[PDB]
Amino acid sequence: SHMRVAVADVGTNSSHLLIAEALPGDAGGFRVIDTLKDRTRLGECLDTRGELTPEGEERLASALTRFRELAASAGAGDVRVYATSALREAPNGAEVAERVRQRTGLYPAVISGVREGELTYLGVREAVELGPDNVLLDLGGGSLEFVRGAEERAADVLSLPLGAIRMTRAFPEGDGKNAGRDVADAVARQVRELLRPHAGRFAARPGTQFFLSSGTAEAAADAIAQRRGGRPAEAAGGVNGERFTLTELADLLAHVARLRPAQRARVPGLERRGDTILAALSVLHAALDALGAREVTVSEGALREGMLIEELAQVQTFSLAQRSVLATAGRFGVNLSHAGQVAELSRELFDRLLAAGETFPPPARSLLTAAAVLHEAGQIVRGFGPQDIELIAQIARYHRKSLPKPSHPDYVALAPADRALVARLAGILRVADGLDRAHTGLARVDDLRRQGQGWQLRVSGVTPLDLAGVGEKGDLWAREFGPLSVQN
Ligand SMILES: [K+]
Ligand SMILES: [K+]
Incomplete structure (x- = not known):
């Protein structure tokens, strides 16, 4: 019930943090809990070439470390980070952001x-x-x-x-x-x-x-x-x-x-x-x-206030657009923004595949949504029957080297068509989590077309981390649907 959210902006003078708690009623409102500023002065850490220096990277990482700590002390845990002019114009900004994510866990995502x-x-x-x-x-x-x-x-x-x-x-x-x-x-x-x-x-x-x-x-x-x-x-x-x-x-x-x-x-x-x-x-x-x-x-x-509004807008309206599914993911303490964005992207990819000719069974869309929202609930690895939830469970937890091996006891083997359904929806879901790897909520599918025996995917609102995640999370899509090329 006491679900708290953190957003931050990394600019050119300083970096800013807002931690807040949302308001009941799927209204789109929030109550301010804490704010924090950091004199990151990134615009004073650019070289003659416009690149952010290793000293700027350290000031960046330091600020996001302060932000991640305050956000967790308040109970938010995860922080969405947007970055503006300094990192946007720096020829090494993508590199800086990937490096700073490794150090802190927070990715500073450049917006236009x-x-x-x-x-x-x-x-x-x-x-x-x-x-x-x-x-x-x-x-x-x-x-x-x-x-x-x-x-x-x-x-x-x-x-x-x-x-x-x-x-x-x-x-x-x-x-x-x-x-x-x-x-x-x-x-x-x-x-x-x-x-x-x-x-x-x-x-x-x-x-x-x-x-x-x-x-x-x-x-x-x-x-x-x-x-x-x-x-x-x-x-x-x-x-x-x-x-x-x-x-x-x-x-x-x-x-x-x-x-x-x-x-x-x-x-x-x-x-x-x-x-x-x-x-x-x-x-x-x-x-x-x-x-x-x-x-x-x-x-x-x-910026940071509008970041929280845009987030609460999509998150709460998506629950209106399964509404218990996002709520049940809340009971497992997951990042609802990520889960909702991954579910929307899964929806987007699913529909294009159907339209291009791929056959799916009727409950498939509902199953992929539910596993989309519970993909990162550590505990887990509602109008769904008991056999559907098992399907959902295996879609959320799909991996080639499964924790139970087929020979090992307690191994759950479905019927061949359900195994094949799980694999095809898990490849969709993996591409989707790739498209929100930066936790921006900004990715959207624009066009998904067959390209020979494979596919061509056009995405907007995507950071260089997101694009890299699809490449690293798309191998299953290739085995199930065919080679995937992403653009834009
Ligand atoms: K500005
Ligand atoms: K003038």
């Missing part, structure tokens, strides 16, 4: 900037009052997402390389009096060059509400509130829902550009961003000005 904007927008929705027409800016250390949408989800997402660290490094500050103003001006021109062909999609219309998320914008809201004679936001309840104007942002930026980098970390509210804050504030001002914004609201919800 569009999907980063999409999920961030759901996090903002969980924190503030979106209206019929919203434009969100999310400035990280590496990129800046522009998102527009209405009251429930994103409509258009653009992702630009205008991040706080990236812009600080791309316009190094000089030694003169106007050095800060000159960095601000040049950063502001870079924003204009890259946004200009897309500005209209995010431009102010009558009634448009503008929102900012993430730590630069939160620091700026705090600095502006303190410049209006306010108290530090940490002494208060945070900055969620605070509003400031474009003029106030402009005023703070002018002050910052006049200061020297070390002086900026003594500006109240900016003490933890002195090195990137000048460039960061230029990005924010220039972009908002390009879009015609005059006021913004700041949100403390971001």
Whole structure:
């Protein structure tokens, strides 16, 4: 009943963790239990080639070790990890992520900037009052997402390389009096060059509400509130829902550009961003000005909140879409997200095989779903008859070197057609667990076609770990249905 969930995002400035407990009623809601930030500073750990250094890998692994520990102390156990610009753009990111999974057990799965904007927008929705027409800016250390949408989800997402660290490094500050103003001006021109062909999609219309998320914008809201004679936001309840104007942002930026980098970390509210804050504030001002914004609201919800919403959405709606089967897997303490995603992928692969001509018996789909949800219940290695559950049991636990050997007592041998059914469904299920090996819930089958005497599988939303898992978990598919080639 007390089922707790953990999600994390690995970005360019820092890494973030949210541990929460879901709300009853298959509603899609959660109660926050714990949050954690880690100054992983991956964007400062890139080499001249853009590769993440062994020191960045260590900081990564360290953060995911902290995350895995806190998540288990709270009772979550498994953590879904998404990664944004630093690891996404690093030529060695796939390697880094596989290495870091070996060390910690957590795989940092790179998502597209569009999907980063999409999920961030759901996090903002969980924190503030979106209206019929919203434009969100999310400035990280590496990129800046522009998102527009209405009251429930994103409509258009653009992702630009205008991040706080990236812009600080791309316009190094000089030694003169106007050095800060000159960095601000040049950063502001870079924003204009890259946004200009897309500005209209995010431009102010009558009634448009503008929102900012993430730590630069939160620091700026705090600095502006303190410049209006306010108290530090940490002494208060945070900055969620605070509003400031474009003029106030402009005023703070002018002050910052006049200061020297070390002086900026003594500006109240900016003490933890002195090195990137000048460039960061230029990005924010220039972009908002390009879009015609005059006021913004700041949100403390971001990627990790939308990660929990998207997860709870699919997981709870799948149980509505066997509903006890996901619940019974809960009694065995399994990762319901993984189990539900593996069941959906099994469903997807099964239907294409049927449509291509493969004959299956009527209960086969129901059997594969049930074994899909109980594949990782250590204890196990409802409208199902006693013979069906035995079939389900053997599908969940299929291996060539079975723990009981045929000659050994207690060995359970089915009838030949059931043996053959188990093998064919276990090959489907294994491909499915491969497609969610990264535990992202993001894989989807797009097309599965016969290719000669074998098959060709097209998958989307798949990480390099997921694709590797199918290759390592698809040998049974090849014996049962024919050689399998996966693409995209
Ligand atoms: K971001
Ligand atoms: K310009």
